Every structure is written in C-alpha cells, then in structure tokens.
Amino acid sequence: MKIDILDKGFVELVDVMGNDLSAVRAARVSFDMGLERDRHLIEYLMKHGHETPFEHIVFTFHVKAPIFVARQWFRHRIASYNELSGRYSKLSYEFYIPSPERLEGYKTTIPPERVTEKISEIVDKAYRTYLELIESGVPREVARIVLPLNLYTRFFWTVNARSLMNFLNLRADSHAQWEIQQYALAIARIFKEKCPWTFEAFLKYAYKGDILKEVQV
Amino acid sequence: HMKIDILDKGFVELVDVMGNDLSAVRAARVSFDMGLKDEERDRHLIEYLMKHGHETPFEHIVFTFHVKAPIFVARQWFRHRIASYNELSGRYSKLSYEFYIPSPERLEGYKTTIPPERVTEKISEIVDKAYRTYLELIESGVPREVARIVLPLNLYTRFFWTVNARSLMNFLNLRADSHAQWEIQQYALAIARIFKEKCPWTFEAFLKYAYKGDIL
Amino acid sequence: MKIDILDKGFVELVDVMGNDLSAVRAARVSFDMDEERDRHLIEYLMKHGHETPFEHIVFTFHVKAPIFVARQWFRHRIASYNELSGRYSKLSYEFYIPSPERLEGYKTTIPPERVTEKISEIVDKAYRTYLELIESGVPREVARIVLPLNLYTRFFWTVNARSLMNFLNLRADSHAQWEIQQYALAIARIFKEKCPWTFEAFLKYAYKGDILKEV
Amino acid sequence: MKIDILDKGFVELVDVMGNDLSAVRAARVSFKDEERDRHLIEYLMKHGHETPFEHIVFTFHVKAPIFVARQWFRHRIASYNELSGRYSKLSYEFYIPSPERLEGYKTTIPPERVTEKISEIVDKAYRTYLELIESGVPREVARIVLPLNLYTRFFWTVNARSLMNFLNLRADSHAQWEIQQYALAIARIFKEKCPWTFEAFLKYAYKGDILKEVQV
Numbered sequence: 007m008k009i010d011i012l013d014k015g016f017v018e019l020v021d022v023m024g025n026d027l028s029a030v031r032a033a034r035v036s037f038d039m040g041l042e043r044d045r046h047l048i049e050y051l052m053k054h055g056h057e058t059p060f061e062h063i064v065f066t067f068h069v070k071a072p073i074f075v076a077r078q079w080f081r082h083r084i085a086s087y088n089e090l091s092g093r094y095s096k097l098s099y100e101f102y103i104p105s106p107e108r109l110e111g112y113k114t115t116i117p118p119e120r121v122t123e124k125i126s127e128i129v130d131k132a133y134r135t136y137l138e139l140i141e142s143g144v145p146r147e148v149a150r151i152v153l154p155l156n157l158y159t160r161f162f163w164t165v166n167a168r169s170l171m172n173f174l175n176l177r178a179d180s181h182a183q184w185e186i187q188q189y190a191l192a193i194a195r196i197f198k199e200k201c202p203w204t205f206e207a208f209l210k211y212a213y214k215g216d217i218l219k220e221v222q223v
Numbered sequence: 224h225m226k227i228d229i230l231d232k233g234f235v236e237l238v239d240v241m242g243n244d245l246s247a248v249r250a251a252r253v254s255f256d257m258g259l260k261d262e263e264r265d266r267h268l269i270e271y272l273m274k275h276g277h278e279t280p281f282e283h284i285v286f287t288f289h290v291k292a293p294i295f296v297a298r299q300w301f302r303h304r305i306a307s308y309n310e311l312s313g314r315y316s317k318l319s320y321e322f323y324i325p326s327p328e329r330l331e332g333y334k335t336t337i338p339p340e341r342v343t344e345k346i347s348e349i350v351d352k353a354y355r356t357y358l359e360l361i362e363s364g365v366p367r368e369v370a371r372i373v374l375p376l377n378l379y380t381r382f383f384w385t386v387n388a389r390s391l392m393n394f395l396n397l398r399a400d401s402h403a404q405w406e407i408q409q410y411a412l413a414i415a416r417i418f419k420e421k422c423p424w425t426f427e428a429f430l431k432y433a434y435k436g437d438i439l
Numbered sequence: 440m441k442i443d444i445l446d447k448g449f450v451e452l453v454d455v456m457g458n459d460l461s462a463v464r465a466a467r468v469s470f471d472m473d474e475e476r477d478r479h480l481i482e483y484l485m486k487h488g489h490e491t492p493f494e495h496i497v498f499t500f501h502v503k504a505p506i507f508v509a510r511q512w513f514r515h516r517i518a519s520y521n522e523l524s525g526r527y528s529k530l531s532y533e534f535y536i537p538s539p540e541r542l543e544g545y546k547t548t549i550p551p552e553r554v555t556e557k558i559s560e561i562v563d564k565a566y567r568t569y570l571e572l573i574e575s576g577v578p579r580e581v582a583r584i585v586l587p588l589n590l591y592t593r594f595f596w597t598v599n600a601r602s603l604m605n606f607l608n609l610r611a612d613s614h615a616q617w618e619i620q621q622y623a624l625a626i627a628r629i630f631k632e633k634c635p636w637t638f639e640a641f642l643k644y645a646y647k648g649d650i651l652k653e654v
Numbered sequence: 655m656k657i658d659i660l661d662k663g664f665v666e667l668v669d670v671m672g673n674d675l676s677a678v679r680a681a682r683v684s685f686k687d688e689e690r691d692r693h694l695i696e697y698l699m700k701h702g703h704e705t706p707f708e709h710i711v712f713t714f715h716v717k718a719p720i721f722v723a724r725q726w727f728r729h730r731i732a733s734y735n736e737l738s739g740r741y742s743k744l745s746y747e748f749y750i751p752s753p754e755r756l757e758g759y760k761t762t763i764p765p766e767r768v769t770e771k772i773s774e775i776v777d778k779a780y781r782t783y784l785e786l787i788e789s790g791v792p793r794e795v796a797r798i799v800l801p802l803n804l805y806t807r808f809f810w811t812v813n814a815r816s817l818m819n820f821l822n823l824r825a826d827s828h829a830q831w832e833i834q835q836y837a838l839a840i841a842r843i844f845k846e847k848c849p850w851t852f853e854a855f856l857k858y859a860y861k862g863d864i865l866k867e868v869q870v
C-alpha cells in the first residue's frame with residue numbers, strides 16, 4: 007500500500023499489528039471476557055471515550071515529505087521516528103514545487119505560474135551551492151544548511167491507533183497546512199482499510215476534524 | 224503464540240508482534256538513505272546500534288502480551304509508563320478466587336520462627352477469610368468497587384500489555400534483576416524468553432552490550 | 440496548602456512552576472509577540488483546543504491515598520511518581536474505612552454500619568497476620584501481600600496543567616469511583632487557586648466531566 | 655540567565671521548579687542535611703534510580719537554527735512552543751557559519767568563501783520570500799524557500815531526568831557541533847540550579863565526552 011502525495015512524496019504502509027478485534031480483545035479483559043457484538047463494542051468505546059483499547063493496534067509507515075511538513079509531523083511526540091540524515095547522507099535533488107493550483111483562492115500581484123517559477127529558481131540555486139560546497143570538502147552537516155524547507159526527506163513512523171486518531175483530528179483538518187492535510191488523508195485511507203470498524207466509529211463519534219466528513223477515504 | 228506459566232497460577236502469553244530484528248535494521252538504514260542487505264551486514268548493524276546506544280530503531284518492534292499476575296506485581300509493572308495497558312476491573316466484574324500463595328521454598332535462605340509451610344498456611348487463611356468477606360458483601364448488595372477493598376494484594380489480575388522493544392529492554396534492565404522482587408523477576412524472565420524467541424539478534428546484542436541486570 | 444480526603448487521606452501542594460501567564464508566554468512565542476488581552480488569549484487557547492501552552496505550568500503534589508485509588512491514579516502515564524515502598528519499609532496501621540454514608544442510596548441485606556465493621560475486621564486480621572509474619576522472620580516484600588487494597592500509601596505526583604486537565608476530565612467525573620472523585624475535587628481546588636484563569640476557561644470550554652460543574 | 659550561542663542564538667532560563675532537594679524530597683516521599691542529602695543524590699545516580707529527578711523542572715527560551723531545532727525537537731519527553739512560519743512574518747535572521755567553523759577540514763576554497771557562498775544564497779532566498787509575501791503569496795507557502803539555517807525561537811519545558819538524557823546525547827562529540835554549543839549552555843544553567851545533581855550526573859551517569867573536558 008503506497009499512496010502518492012504532492013509532486014514527489016508518498017505515504018506507504020510498512021507494517022501493522024492487530025486489527026479492530028485487537029481493541030475489542032483488550033477492552034474485554036475489563037469484564038473478564040474475550041472476543042456482531044465486537045463491532046458494537048468499538049462504537050461504545052469510541053462514543054464513551056474509552057481510547058486506551060485502541061493503543062494495542064499499531065502501524066509503521068514509510069513517509070516521503072517536505073521538511074516543513076515533517077517538522078509539523080514530528081511534533082507528535084507519542085510515536086516513534088527514524089529519518090534520513092542530512093549529516094550522514096548526500097541529499098538528492100528532490101524538492102516540493104507547488105503547482106499553480108496551490109494558490110487557487112488567493113489574489114496575487116504576480117501570476118501563480120510565476121510564483122511556482124521563483125520557488126524553482128531558488129531551489130535550483132540552493133542545491134547547486136550545496137553540491138559546490140560538498141565538492142569543495144565542506145562537511146555535509148554544514149553544506150546542507152543552505153537547502154530550503156521544501157526539500158524532501160524520508161522517515162519511518164510507528165504509531166498506535168489512539169495517537170494516530172489524535173493526529174487525524176489535528177492534521178486531517180482545515181486549520182492545518184494544506185500540504186500536511188494531504189498526507190493525513192492518505193494516512194486516513196490506510197487506517198480505514200486496516201481498521202474499518204474503528205475508523206467508522208471514529209468519524210461518527212470522536213473525530214474532531216472537518217475534512218474526513220466531506221472527503222471519501 | 225507463546226505461553227509461559229509463572230508462580231502458582233500466573234502466566235505471560237504472547238498475543239501478537241509487529242516486526243522482527245530486520246524492522247530495526249530497516250528503520251536505522253533510512254538514515255543513510257539505504258535499506259536492508261545481507262545477514263552478516265544487517266546483524267552487524269544491530270549490535271552496532273546496541274553498542275553505540277542508538278535505541279530508537281528498536282522502537283519499531285512492538286509486542287502485545289496477555290498477563291495474569293498478582294496485584295502487587297502488577298503495581299510495580301504498571302509503573303513503566305512507555306507502554307499501553309488494559310486490565311481486569313474490580314469495579315465492574317466479580318473477582319475470582321485466585322490468589323498467589325507463596326510456596327515454602329520462597330522462604331529459602333530466611334530462617335523463620337514458624338516453619339515455612341506454616342507461613343504458607345497462614346497466608347492462605349487470611350486470603351480465604353478476606354475473599355469470603357468480599358463474597359459476603361457482594362451478595363448483600365454492596366457495590367463491587369467497595370467490596371473489593373478488602374481483597375489482599377496477592378489477588379490475581381489480568382491485563383494486556385503492548386510495549387515496543389526499546390521500552391521492553393528498559394523493563395528487563397530493571398525487572399530482570401536481583402534487586403527487584405523475586406516475583407516480578409520471574410515474570411521478567413518469561414518476558415525475556417519471548418523477546419529472545421522473536422528477536423534473536425536484538426536480544427543477544429542486548430545481553431552482550433546493553434543489558435544492565437544480573438539474572439539474565 | 441493541604442486538603443484532607445476520605446478518613447485519613449490528603450492532597451497537599453508541594454510546589455508549582457508558573458501560573459496563567461506561563462501559558463500565555465509560551466503561546467506568544469508563536470506570533471513573535473496586559474490582563475484583558477492575556478486572560479482572553481487563555482480562553483481562546485482553551486476554546487480552540489490549543490493545549491500545548493498549558494504544559495508549561497507544572498505542579499508537584501504529596502498524596503496520601505488507599506492503594507485501590509492509587510492503582511487508578513497511576514494509570515495516568517504523562518506524569519511523574521515516587522511512592523513509599525512496601526518492600527523497603529514496615530507499613531503503618533492505616534487503612535481506608537468507608538463511612539456508613541458510602542453505601543447511601545444502595546439497598547443492602549447488611550446494614551451499612553455493619554459493612555463498615557466487616558471491612559475493619561478484615562483490615563485488623565490482615566494487618567496482624569502481617570506483623571505476625573514479619574516478627575516471624577518473613578521478608579517484608581512477602582508479608583505485605585496479605586494486606587488489603589484499602590491500605591493507605593503515599594506518593595509525590597508531578598504533572599503539568601494539560602495532563603492535570605485530562606486527569607480532571609476522567610477523575611472529576613461520576614463515572615469514576617467516588618473515592619478518587621474526592622481526590623480530583625481537591626486537585627481541582629488547588630489548580631483553581633494557582634491558575635484561576637486557566638481553571639475558569641477549562642470549566643467553560645474544555646472540561647468534559649460533570650461534578651466540577653456542580654460542586 | 656541568558657547565554658549567547660552561535661552568531662544570533664541564545665539559551666535563556668525562563669523558570670524553574672525545585673532544586674536538588676526536590677529530588678531528595680521525592681525519593682523519600684516527605685514534606686536540610688547536605689551530607690545525607692547530597693549522598694542520597696549520588697546514591698540515586700549511581701544505582702540508576704532516576705525518577706526522583708523528574709520532580710525538578712526547567713523552562714527554557716531558545717533561539718536557534720531550524721536544523722538545530724529539528725534535532726532538538728526529537729526529544730519527545732518535553733514540552734515545546736515555537737514561532738510559526740505559517741502565521742508570523744519571518745525576520746532576516748540566519749546562522750552564517752564563520753570561517754573558523756571549517757578549521758581542520760581541507761577545502762578547495764578559502765573558508766571565508768564558504769561563508770560568502772552561504773551568505774549569498776541565504777540573501778537570495780530571503781529576498782524571494784519577501785517578494786512572494788508582498789505579491790500576496792500566503793506565508794505558509796512563501797517560507798518554503800527559506801534555508802534550514804533560518805533562526806527560530808521556542809519555549810522548552812523539561813524535567814532534570816529528560817534534560818540529563820539530552821546532555822548525554824547532545825553534549826557529546828558525535829552530535830553536530832552547533833547543537834553541542836547549546837547543550838553546553840543548557841548544562842551551565844542546570845549546574846547553576848542543581849549543583850548536586852549535575853556533579854553526581856557527571857560522576858556516575860553521564861555518557862557524553864565534552865562535559866568532563868569543558869568547565870561548566
């Protein structure tokens with residue numbers, strides 16, 4: 007399962023542990039019980055605020071995204087991350103270039119096409135300078151500081167269902183930057199495919215965001 | 224699928240697992256824009272990570288356990304915050320007559336006034352009386368959340384535990400150690416055993432370069 | 440500042456870092472930024488779900504509570520704890536004995552005041568058996584396993600305003616066991632004194648519980 | 655307490671709760687005696703009993719380059735609040751490495767040229783950013799052309815235990831030089847507020863390699 011986001015990014019599901027029944031399973035222990043009834047428990051827990059059972063469902067994603075996007079994403083402390091290093095590796099020529107449609111809805115002095123053009127020009131000069139510094143023997147950890155925030159980076163993300171839901175509440179929302187919204191939708195799609203009952207219950211009883219109720223999957 | 228019996232009626236049962244040794248290898252490699260490789264190389268990285276103290280990669284390995292243990296053991300266990308728990312409720316369900324009765328050998332080394340067997344006998348008695356009082360209150364209409372307050376700390380409880388490899392190793396350092404209570408140690412050995420079965424490379428590397436305990 | 444809870448328990452403030460303005464300062468370092476403007480920002484943050492700024496206010500409490508209460512309290516992982524050790528020190532003769540009014544509203548085959556008695560009896564026999572074992576040479580970590588769940592323990596609790604609010608949402612609520620609700624009420628009271636603005640705003644826009652809305 | 659770091663950065667102590675005695679009070683669970691108290695701090699540090707130090711909390715105000723902040727924010731056991739590029743107009747403040755930063759590395763161009771190369775690109779980037787903002791492009795979009803050396807500010811609230819982990823990892827030669835400088839500043843303040851804990855830390859638990867070589 008891999009989903010393309012923006013111009014060069016993506017969200018890919020690396021691994022998953024458990025399913026909706028994992029949460030049903032965990033929840034049952036409270037009443038010395040085990041695993042149509044199970045589906046009803048998910049709703050109950052969701053609408054009543056029993057979030058802990060969903061912590062036993064865990065996902066590991068492989069994400070390709072712009073650093074300005076990663077910086078916001080990494081603010082979610084209840085999860086695990088492992089990212090590409092700008093200190094250790096030679097960064098490749100890959101940057102997020104917004105399409106003219108990105109400025110749809112805003113009045114600008116210069117054409118959307120020009121805006122897209124200027125971002126590219128800057129990206130191009132920045133990367134050349136970066137390579138020139140490295141070729142000259144400048145340490146990678148120093149040379150990379152001239153690279154812009156729209157530079158693509160990669161990382162693994164292991165997070166459980168409760169934290170992922172908090173993530174969707176905050177990122178699969180209109181107040182979050184459009185770019186991370188797009189990633190959140192892909193995360194939602196995958197979440198829905200692996201835990202359909204929890205997902206449906208989540209949208210109907212606890213989701214606090216606004217876009218997942220208008221945009222399918 | 225794994226089950227280890229602990230104490231007289233307890234147990235540690237592996238319910239699920241996500242990833243294996245290579246899950247940490249994958250996570251780690253990404254820092255160099257690389258992926259997996261041969262076994263010799265990948266296994267070398269794991270020990271490398273363990274040696275230098277790079278533990279984040281091991282967080283991508285997650286375990287889900289089903290544990291049955293006495294409350295005094297569980298209390299110490301739930302002190303490990305970097306994990307998830309779901310436990311049997313004394314407020315909601317009627318508790319079963321199951322308590323941890325120490326065997327006479329638990330007193331080995333300690334010279335006692337009364338024979339060990341007697342200590343065992345006395346523990347069972349108090350437990351029996353407490354439980355009868357509990358059943359008595361429950362059957363007379365007393366709310367369960369109130370009636371259970373007479374139950375002793377050796378009452379058995381059950382819970383689910385989802386924890387990743389890194390937090391798990393911290394658990395073993397602290398609980399797979401002679402400084403921890405013998406009872407919790409036994410559970411830690413069972414946890415280590417399962418960790419060994421599922422992530423051989425990580426475990427071995429752990430024991431050789433990071434494990435700070437003494438019983439493993 | 441100390442508040443007694445139940446028959447022998449309590450909640451006392453040990454220390455606190457910051458106040459309503461601590462949250463105001465944390466948040467202002469976002470837009471690169473007086474009373475009305477500040478208290479309004481606080482109500483604004485609370486109303487929209489911007490909770491991180493409240494993490495910069497921290498409290499440390501000293502709590503004396505029954506273990507069954509502590510087992511529920513310790514489930515709140517986003518915080519720090521340090522409790523008395525039952526295997527290191529001899530436990531004192533202090534247990535939570537519910538008052539007859541605790542069974543109020545319930546129809547029981549045994550008079551409430553009789554239930555109170557049965558609980559005391561167990562406590563007494565369990566504790567004596569415990570001292571009997573210890574004096575007999577049984578190590579404390581083993582002898583104490585016969586003690587009941589209403590045995591009082593003590594601990595230090597350091598938590599920030601955000602986690603504290605999650606705690607009040609879940610514990611200062613009728614779905615929580617009454618005994619812990621009482622402690623949560625005490626926690627809320629101290630929190631109100633130190634952060635009136637944050638507290639006021641919490642009740643009005645984020646508080647999900649029910650009893651703080653009536654007590 | 656405010657310490658200048660790099661060319662435009664700084665570490666400022668905003669607030670602090672408790673001191674060395676706070677860890678002591680927590681460990682004993684009560685509420686003095688330097689001999690015993692300090693001895694206890696060292697005992698706790700020597701045997702790995704770290705939870706008591708979580709009762710000591712700091713709030714810092716930091717100004718640092720995004721590439722430094724990104725590494726810093728990887729420390730999850732803490733609280734943060736940073737300036738927003740989506741909401742605020744960014745100031746013309748970037749970290750420009752001085753020639754000395756390249757002492758020891760053999761380059762095909764004079765270290766001063768590297769400084770100029772970096773300064774020029776930073777200048778171009780900021781100028782395009784300003785033109786984008788002026789023409790009407792949304793802040794959150796216009797700032798994506800800004801370099802990783804753009805300075806940002808944030809509030810950091812962390813307890814002594816997590817801060818000690820931070821020092822282990824950052825006040826070390828393996829961490830990038832730029833964040834090492836901040837860690838030193840963090841260490842000075844910590845040392846100033848909790849002299850007993852810091853000394854005990856350096857003596858028994860610290861895993862880094864610079865704090866035992868550089869005063870305060």
Ligand SMILES: Cc1cc2nc3c(=O)[nH]c(=O)nc-3n(C[C@H](O)[C@H](O)[C@H](O)COP(=O)(O)OP(=O)(O)OC[C@H]3O[C@@H](n4cnc5c(N)ncnc54)[C@H](O)[C@@H]3O)c2cc1C
Nearest residue numbers: 302303304305397402403518520521522524705708815816
């Ligand atoms: C021999 C022994 C004796 C003990 N005696 C006592 C006692 O007398 N009183 C008592 O109350 N407890 C006692 N404990 C419990 C101990 O204090 C810890 O609570 C327990 O070991 C859980 O460990 P942890 O904090 O390392 O783990 P977790 O809570 O699971 O945390 C794992 C890691 O994340 C961290 N971490 C998590 N949360 C925070 C935070 N809020 N701030 C900073 N870092 C954080 C640390 O790096 C930690 O090692 C004892 C434990 C042992 C093994």
Ligand SMILES: Cc1cc2nc3c(=O)[nH]c(=O)nc-3n(C[C@H](O)[C@H](O)[C@H](O)COP(=O)(O)OP(=O)(O)OC[C@H]3O[C@@H](n4cnc5c(N)ncnc54)[C@H](O)[C@@H]3O)c2cc1C
Nearest residue numbers: 036058061168169308309310312514515516517609614615
């Ligand atoms: C009325 C009531 C009934 C209950 N019944 C039961 C029961 O039958 N069985 C049982 O085991 N427990 C039960 N609990 C305990 C409950 O499951 C929680 O453990 C407890 O409320 C502590 O809450 P918390 O997880 O929200 O808080 P904290 O552990 O303090 O966490 C605060 C916040 O950080 C989060 N968080 C922390 N750690 C993680 C993580 N690892 N993954 C994802 N998010 C995380 C969430 O956003 C959370 O709200 C009950 C509680 C109440 C109030």
Ligand SMILES: Cc1cc2nc3c(=O)[nH]c(=O)nc-3n(C[C@H](O)[C@H](O)[C@H](O)COP(=O)(O)OP(=O)(O)OC[C@H]3O[C@@H](n4cnc5c(N)ncnc54)[C@H](O)[C@@H]3O)c2cc1C
Nearest residue numbers: 085087088089091254279389390728729730731823828829
């Ligand atoms: C020299 C150096 C090189 C690095 N290289 C890379 C790299 O190539 N790629 C990369 O992505 N990162 C890299 N990092 C970042 C590193 O992986 C950690 O994210 C960073 O050091 C923050 O540390 P921490 O996990 O110990 O701290 P915190 O996140 O603050 O956590 C403190 C303690 O609580 C714990 N803890 C917190 N959360 C969890 C959890 N979810 N599960 C288990 N335990 C938990 C542990 O006991 C931990 O030590 C590097 C750091 C250094 C110092």
Ligand SMILES: Cc1cc2nc3c(=O)[nH]c(=O)nc-3n(C[C@H](O)[C@H](O)[C@H](O)COP(=O)(O)OP(=O)(O)OC[C@H]3O[C@@H](n4cnc5c(N)ncnc54)[C@H](O)[C@@H]3O)c2cc1C
Nearest residue numbers: 081082083084176181182469491601602732734735736738
């Ligand atoms: C529209 C929008 C605007 C934003 N603007 C800003 C800004 O201007 N400046 C800025 O710095 N950030 C900003 N953020 C980031 C925000 O402050 C959070 O850090 C981010 O959403 C991650 O969320 P979290 O804290 O809920 O999640 P996580 O860090 O993953 O935590 C999940 C849950 O555990 C909890 N938790 C975890 N750690 C702690 C802790 N240490 N103390 C108490 N509770 C804890 C809470 O219950 C939390 O919801 C913004 C986010 C959004 C969506």
Ligand SMILES: O=c1[nH]c(=O)n([C@H]2C[C@H](O)[C@@H](COP(=O)(O)O)O2)cc1Br
Nearest residue numbers: 077078079081182183736737738739740
């Ligand atoms: O929508 C947002 N999402 C987010 O995660 N932040 C966090 C990210 C970063 O640590 C700092 C400033 O981010 P921006 O430049 O993207 O606004 O606060 C801020 C905003 Br607004």
Ligand SMILES: O=c1[nH]c(=O)n([C@H]2C[C@H](O)[C@@H](COP(=O)(O)O)O2)cc1Br
Nearest residue numbers: 298299300302403404522523524525526
């Ligand atoms: O070895 C120990 N392990 C542990 O987790 N505690 C925590 C458990 C409980 O929250 C409180 C008191 O525990 P004991 O009564 O078991 O000592 O401190 C204490 C000790 Br000593």
Ligand SMILES: O=c1[nH]c(=O)n([C@H]2C[C@H](O)[C@@H](COP(=O)(O)O)O2)cc1Br
Nearest residue numbers: 310311312313314510511512514615616
């Ligand atoms: O209201 C509750 N609060 C709580 O914290 N638990 C946690 C406490 C303990 O770890 C386990 C069982 O608790 P009780 O016996 O008190 O129900 O689940 C359960 C319930 Br119901």
Ligand SMILES: O=c1[nH]c(=O)n([C@H]2C[C@H](O)[C@@H](COP(=O)(O)O)O2)cc1Br
Nearest residue numbers: 089090091092093724725726728829830
């Ligand atoms: O020393 C380091 N410190 C750090 O915090 N990272 C984390 C920061 C970021 O999330 C990602 C890539 O960082 P660099 O570009 O700085 O290498 O891994 C990496 C290295 Br190496």
